[PDB]
Design a protein around this ligand. Sequence first.
Ligand code: MG
Ligand code: MG
Length: 230
Amino acid sequence: MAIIKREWLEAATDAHKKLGWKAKGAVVSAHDPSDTGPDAKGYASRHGSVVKRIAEGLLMDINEGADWATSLAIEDGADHYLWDGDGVGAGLRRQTTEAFSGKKITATMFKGSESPFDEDAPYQAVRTIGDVFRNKRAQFYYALADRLYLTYRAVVHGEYADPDDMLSFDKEAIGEKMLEKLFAELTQIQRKFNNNGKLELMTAVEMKQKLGIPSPNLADALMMCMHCPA
Ligand SMILES: [Mg+2]
Ligand SMILES: [Mg+2]
């Protein structure tokens, strides 16, 4: 039921170097403020299709966490910042917008439980996005999975893909230790049964209680980065 293969992640490591392309596009950053306020938090940032930072935020309350993540977004030259507002982070917009005052950084609250973005559009790669994905959490985790798989096929099978549809991990920028932590979380993200035939993922609470796996905040942070707001 896992949606991402470890082999894809290994292939995607330095894929831009292996295949000879450079990051192009906006810088997108996202923050997972943890489930519960004080536990481990996540941040991820990419420049176009190249992931450049994966960071954990430790021993912080919810407000310290948002200060940390928004400061990283500033350091990373983000054009767009997202954060998970479906839970304990639902009240962070004022602090977030204060942090970005005077800077050209958009702030978007991500709510994974919402219906998918652009849900009446045709599904690509009479069936619409909303017919395929239950919600944004599924939509954007599969956006990630699709990028990774296409990257794997390009790197390992020599099948051309547009870099804009791929995802590379800049290992030197991110650091080996944090990259490994991210990967160990990403391979735990799992599909669950859905009674309307839609793609749906296990929630963090389910992952915890059913399988004993801790909240995948780095994975979630990266997933949210897949949505570029505008
Ligand atoms: Mg969350
Ligand atoms: Mg989370």
